[PDB]
Amino acid sequence: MQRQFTSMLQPGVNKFSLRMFGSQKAVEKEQERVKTAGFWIIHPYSDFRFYWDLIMLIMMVGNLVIIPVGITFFTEQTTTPWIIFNVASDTVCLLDLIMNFRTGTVNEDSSEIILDPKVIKMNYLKSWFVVDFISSIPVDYIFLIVERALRIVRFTKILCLLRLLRLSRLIRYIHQWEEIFHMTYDLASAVVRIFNLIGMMLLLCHWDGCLQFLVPLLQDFPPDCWVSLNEMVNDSWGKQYSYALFKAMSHMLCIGYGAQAPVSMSDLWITMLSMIVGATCYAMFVGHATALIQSLDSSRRQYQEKYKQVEQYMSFHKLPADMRQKIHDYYEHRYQGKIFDEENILNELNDPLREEIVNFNCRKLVATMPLFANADPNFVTAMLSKLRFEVFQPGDYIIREGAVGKKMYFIQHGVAGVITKSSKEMKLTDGSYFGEICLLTKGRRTASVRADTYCRLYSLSVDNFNEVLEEYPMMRRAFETVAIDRLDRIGKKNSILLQKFQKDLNTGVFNNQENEILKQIVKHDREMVQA
Amino acid sequence: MQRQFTSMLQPGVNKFSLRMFGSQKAVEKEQERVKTAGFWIIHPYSDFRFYWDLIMLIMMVGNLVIIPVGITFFTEQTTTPWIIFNVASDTVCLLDLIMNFRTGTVNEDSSEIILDPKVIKMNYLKSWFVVDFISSIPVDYIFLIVERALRIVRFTKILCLLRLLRLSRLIRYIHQWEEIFHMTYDLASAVVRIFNLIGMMLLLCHWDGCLQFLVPLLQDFPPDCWVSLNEMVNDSWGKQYSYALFKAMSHMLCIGYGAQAPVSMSDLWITMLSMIVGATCYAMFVGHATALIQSLDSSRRQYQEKYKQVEQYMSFHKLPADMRQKIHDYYEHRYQGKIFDEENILNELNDPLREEIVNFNCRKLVATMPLFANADPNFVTAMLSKLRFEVFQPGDYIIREGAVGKKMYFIQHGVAGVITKSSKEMKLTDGSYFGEICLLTKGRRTASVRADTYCRLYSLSVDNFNEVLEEYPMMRRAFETVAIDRLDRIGKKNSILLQKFQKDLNTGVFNNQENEILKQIVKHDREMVQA
Amino acid sequence: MQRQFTSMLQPGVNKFSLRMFGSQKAVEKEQERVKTAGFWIIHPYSDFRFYWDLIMLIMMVGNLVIIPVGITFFTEQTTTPWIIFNVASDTVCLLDLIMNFRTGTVNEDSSEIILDPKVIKMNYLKSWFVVDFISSIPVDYIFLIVERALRIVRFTKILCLLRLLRLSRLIRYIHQWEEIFHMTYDLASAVVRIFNLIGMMLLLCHWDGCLQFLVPLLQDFPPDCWVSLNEMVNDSWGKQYSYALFKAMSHMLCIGYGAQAPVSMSDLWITMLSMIVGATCYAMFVGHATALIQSLDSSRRQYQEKYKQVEQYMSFHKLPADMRQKIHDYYEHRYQGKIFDEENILNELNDPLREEIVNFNCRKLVATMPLFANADPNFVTAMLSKLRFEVFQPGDYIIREGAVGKKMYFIQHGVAGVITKSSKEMKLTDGSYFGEICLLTKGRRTASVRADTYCRLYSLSVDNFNEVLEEYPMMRRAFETVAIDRLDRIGKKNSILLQKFQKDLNTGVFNNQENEILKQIVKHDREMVQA
Ligand SMILES: Nc1ncnc2c1ncn2[C@@H]1O[C@@H]2COP(=O)(O)O[C@H]2[C@H]1O
Numbered sequence A, B, C: 001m002q003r004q005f006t007s008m009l010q011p012g013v014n015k016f017s018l019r020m021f022g023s024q025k026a027v028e029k030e031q032e033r034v035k036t037a038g039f040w041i042i043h044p045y046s047d048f049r050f051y052w053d054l055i056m057l058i059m060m061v062g063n064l065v066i067i068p069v070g071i072t073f074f075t076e077q078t079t080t081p082w083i084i085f086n087v088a089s090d091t092v093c094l095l096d097l098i099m100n101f102r103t104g105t106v107n108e109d110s111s112e113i114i115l116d117p118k119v120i121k122m123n124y125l126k127s128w129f130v131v132d133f134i135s136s137i138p139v140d141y142i143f144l145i146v147e148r149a150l151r152i153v154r155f156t157k158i159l160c161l162l163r164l165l166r167l168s169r170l171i172r173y174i175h176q177w178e179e180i181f182h183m184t185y186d187l188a189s190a191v192v193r194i195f196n197l198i199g200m201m202l203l204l205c206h207w208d209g210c211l212q213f214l215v216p217l218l219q220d221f222p223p224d225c226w227v228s229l230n231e232m233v234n235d236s237w238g239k240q241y242s243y244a245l246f247k248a249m250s251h252m253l254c255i256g257y258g259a260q261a262p263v264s265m266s267d268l269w270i271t272m273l274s275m276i277v278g279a280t281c282y283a284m285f286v287g288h289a290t291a292l293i294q295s296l297d298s299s300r301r302q303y304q305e306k307y308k309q310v311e312q313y314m315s316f317h318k319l320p321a322d323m324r325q326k327i328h329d330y331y332e333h334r335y336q337g338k339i340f341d342e343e344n345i346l347n348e349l350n351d352p353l354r355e356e357i358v359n360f361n362c363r364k365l366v367a368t369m370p371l372f373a374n375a376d377p378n379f380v381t382a383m384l385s386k387l388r389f390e391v392f393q394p395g396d397y398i399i400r401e402g403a404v405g406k407k408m409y410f411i412q413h414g415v416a417g418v419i420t421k422s423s424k425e426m427k428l429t430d431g432s433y434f435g436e437i438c439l440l441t442k443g444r445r446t447a448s449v450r451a452d453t454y455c456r457l458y459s460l461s462v463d464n465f466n467e468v469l470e471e472y473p474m475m476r477r478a479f480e481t482v483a484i485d486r487l488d489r490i491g492k493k494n495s496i497l498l499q500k501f502q503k504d505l506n507t508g509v510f511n512n513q514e515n516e517i518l519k520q521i522v523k524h525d526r527e528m529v530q531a
């Protein structure tokens, strides 16, 4: 009852209300501000106002369709459907006139003033009251009591379009909804938009044909108008309307005239005006179609543009053909036909979303790799936030022996081969890491690592490595243990790292459980290398 | 009198003058340079020249409309309006010829040379004097005294279009004004531009129809021209002009011919030429309409493109559906359907504008938060310039206990919950800050902070924090006091911070008023937490 | 046999399979997962499914072409080609109906579920089974046994288009292939795309003309239809079809009607509908043509835009004309009409590709320059990765004497002149370097270096220089030796560097072979300067 009424009048919490007023607490405060009126008032964001604008829109469309047909072909309409439609439109327009008093205006620059007592009424009386009044003047059944004549009277109903001109915030909300829909579905959105355009053009053709038959009627059908020429002055209204609409549509779409070219001044000038209007609207239609298509094929176009820029670079530097093919298939394997700026996206997001994304991306790595499978989640999240994606092609040398290292790698996909001066070549696969002994000893690379298949790795710089491990030293002890074991395995040895770990162990800092965990890690690594 | 004359001739201070000559002092110097002439001279930026170009434009439009109609349908015109229009156009063209002497040219590469005595006269005598002279030759009433004939004479008046070709700087100023208008109003600008295009095309149709009726007239209406075919050789000039314009417009908009297809060579070739011209101009019209629409829907298109790139990223990484929905609603709540680069904007602005903007943005924070409500404005502006906006979703963990902290947060909207190992959970709301104890003690986070509703915060890094507080130490004392109180409240204690503050207090650096203010701050914080 | 069958059903390793499933090991795992069915099943990426979709596409095109002609002009077809085509289409549609059971669906969000036993059958029974069944219902030869009539029956065959609506993954693969082709060949791609569009429009014209002749046939040719008006009710089917297609095509391309304008209600409304459809499709065609052209001229447009921005900058700063010409010819010589972001490209690539590219770019430098011609490849690759391209114009001063230096240069093309206070001017050419004595002594520049012709150099910063040389000191000794020799040559001397090298030599760190190599380097440099 009154509770539902007040709820309808008060701005309901919705996505549009949140977008316009920030927090939900502000929505509650605005509900309270509406409550401060005491006298009934509808908020420009009320669901009641939304539904009312909806029914007013459907009534305006019905009127736009029906008014010209009546004016032209129906002199007097006293049948049931005509009377009920006229009275329905009259009462609806009057109710809208009334309710436009208690409507809170919404000015720009974040200006929304209820101003129930006087400001809204005064602004409406000064702005648009007279046109809505003459619209709401009832059907000619009341004008005959107050005072071709009928055809002259009904003209006053053409200005009901101004209500549709005012009804635009609902149009903007519908445009937002349709934009969401278009981003969701591609082809359906195109179909809907082109059908909307076709509907607009068809309504214009309707009005044009109505006018083209109306004007020869206001002159009692002179002997040289197209009606008297085609001798269809006595045909039923169906044929007359059909042929008039045909003439109007042929003038719009630039097909031709009707039977023949005009011969009288009246229909001559009407034909010229209709030709101008139709040509302009068809140009607008072509423009909208071009815009729709160009918006449809955006991503493919951007991909082609990036590809062309890469081609221009390779051409400017005059690279060999095989190298160009290598660059192209590398791009194909890295981006897989897609285009985006991952750095910009990750910068736009926030910390919890980035953590969620990297955890989902490296779920399998966290599951398989032992250190992550047993470490504290804060350290895991730090490492995963510091990682960075990379792709390597078969035969490429990921690490060259002797050089200075500045990053380590975590394998996500593929197989990598480790080659030394000895014949012992060891092949790592998913869930294993390499290139950390250089980062742990500050020396040079101790072995060469070459990609055997297409490898997909996650590299970690040396600065981030040192930062994270300075924040967590026990993981550094674990890394050093695994690295010493690997070095002992290949047949080389780093006395610096060995003596450092031996001193740390003799210092008694580690516990029995600690060295047990370290033995578990080294066993797991031995298994992962043997497999 | 002479004062107003000199003021009109001298470049008036306006937005265009400022844009062209930098400082207002340069405008005064150019006024002086004009004064150095001694002989009267109009500056190419004078309001007098502006008004003169305006009236010359309206006269050129009147001539473009009237000349062909006269030439074609009016053999001799001795009535009052015709005579007055001819003499008006003649005197106006002659006055423009005269005033083009004392006009200072404006070359490119910042070249504006008054050069009153000789250079302007010589350049005009060498450039365009003869065509303007033959234009300014008076109406045929003087040519008959000097020496179909009339129709041959009036041709000399067609070259008045060259004056309109010269009048282009006023066109550029009008284009600037219309660009401002178009940036201001959207739909009105589109209506104005399409009406301008339609007017151009209609003027072309006018000239085309005039020619199409003129040529059969110069041949005494042969029996096979369209005029003699339609037997309208004797009709009043109204009907002839109407039907000729109809033929021209049907040829342009590609509807058809007139009554029937041409049958004679003359009108055959004229029809082909008119068809070519009309098709070209309609193609140009379609192009302009497409450009206008595509410029109308720019921002929506850019928003759609960014959304599509985010979608492509999420697809390349194969994220779950709920995570994709979370990303999308986060974007919706962060940007609210708008698109801009805040970093680039703030980099484009300057320091006072940035200070103004951040002060307006954080007005409520400065009002509510006690430290800012009592501190020195320089410190307040430093902090507000260092802040950075952020958005969090409900349930997200803003701060996880035990981790290392690198920023603090100031709440602008929403509610945040503080959870510890104890059951004491404390809820902060607008105007409160958290996450500073880690920055003050260089330890770890002492509690977990989780967003309860959609939170909108302003984060401050640790480097900027330390910089600002090294510039202002008393605020650091206040922060430390509030932090010690909060720690004591939750039930934990940091002996390092406690002993540091105790030593600073025993050092006698603080005053009675100082500790009074600190007690006020701690009381206000207790109230803000209790509420 | 069965081996080839299982191979066809299992997803073959291809570029699309790799793009959809990452590593080849995943492709093998999916082959195994298909093997887990036990009951035969085709994978949505099987080459068998590809070939089947191909033959179904050709059958659908044949049906789209043949069905309307039959329905309209061929009452009963009992000849050999008609019967064989009908039975072929029937069996093909039935086989597709059958095979759509064992087809694994492919949902979005990385969802590919074989689900052989029940899920696929249930989903197909709930989704699209009935329409495919009524399609697969055989030709009317079976419907007559089961129960104008013929023309009523064959309508059931129009819904075979739904199969073409389903066949879209093959369309996407063909679109990928055509995108590769379009990136490869420019003009051929445009020709193919416009021919595709023309084919679509022609098929639509075909259906439209078929309908336009069909409707007057279903009414026994009333006396006022266009057929009875043109008296072609008795002509052979060739002429009737030709004239109907002519009417439809004239309605689409907006030429006109047929003989004359319609006179009856039926063909009146059919003409209006056909006009609407044709205008819409021609608008779509114009849109696609505009998009194709705009995609064709992309790179030229981007180059023009960058040029215009440079022009706007130079205009805003009001630079002289000769300076503007200098800027423009510098741009012409630096980028050579091409446009790309080398930094972004090199950031997108990886380390081995970057090493390959820089090695190919500086091959001649490595060949000619002695230090690189004798040094270790790791040092060479470090230097080449640190270098950076630069271009200088004739007369420009590359290095001014006395100033502080922050980079050295390696000449790739051109000649440079070295000027001192003495008259000894020495000219360096390709393969020589300069500007290292400042970097080695931390003093000031010891001579001026001016470009004589258009120079193309590779500059190396001072930080990278010091980093690389701290990683490799012997090369620093070589640089110092060459620099001391050059200084002694010009007539100046740096006692600091001289004494440092003398102390290093007296320290006995160098070997006989080492100083032999150094003598070789200094001899080679003397030769390169003398030449
Ligand atoms: N036995 C081994 N098994 C697996 N990986 C190894 C082995 N020995 C060395 N590596 C890795 O190969 C890398 C080569 O360079 P680094 O010495 O920087 O670090 C080395 C380790 O990451």
Ligand SMILES: Nc1ncnc2c1ncn2[C@@H]1O[C@@H]2COP(=O)(O)O[C@H]2[C@H]1O
Pocket (backbone or CB within 6 Å): B399, B405, B418, B426, B428, B433, B434, B435, B436, B437, B438, B439, B444, B445, B446, B447, B448, B449, B486, B487, B489, B490, B529
């Ligand atoms: N009693 C409290 N009331 C409000 N906020 C608190 C309280 N105790 C701790 N906090 C905040 O919670 C944060 C958790 O991490 P920090 O220790 O970095 O800094 C802490 C303070 O900002």
Ligand SMILES: Nc1ncnc2c1ncn2[C@@H]1O[C@@H]2COP(=O)(O)O[C@H]2[C@H]1O
Pocket (backbone or CB within 6 Å): C399, C405, C418, C426, C428, C433, C434, C435, C436, C437, C438, C439, C444, C445, C446, C447, C448, C449, C486, C487, C489, C490, C529
């Ligand atoms: N005799 C020479 N031959 C070639 N180049 C020289 C000679 N003397 C000096 N240079 C170069 O000219 C440079 C001028 O500045 P720098 O002293 O930094 O380093 C100097 C050398 O690179």
Ligand SMILES: [Hg+2]
Pocket (backbone or CB within 6 Å): A063, A089, A093, A135, A136, A159, A160
């Ligand atoms: Hg109305």
Ligand SMILES: [Hg+2]
Pocket (backbone or CB within 6 Å): B063, B089, B093, B135, B136, B159, B160
């Ligand atoms: Hg003139």
Ligand SMILES: [Hg+2]
Pocket (backbone or CB within 6 Å): C063, C089, C093, C135, C136, C159, C160
């Ligand atoms: Hg079929």
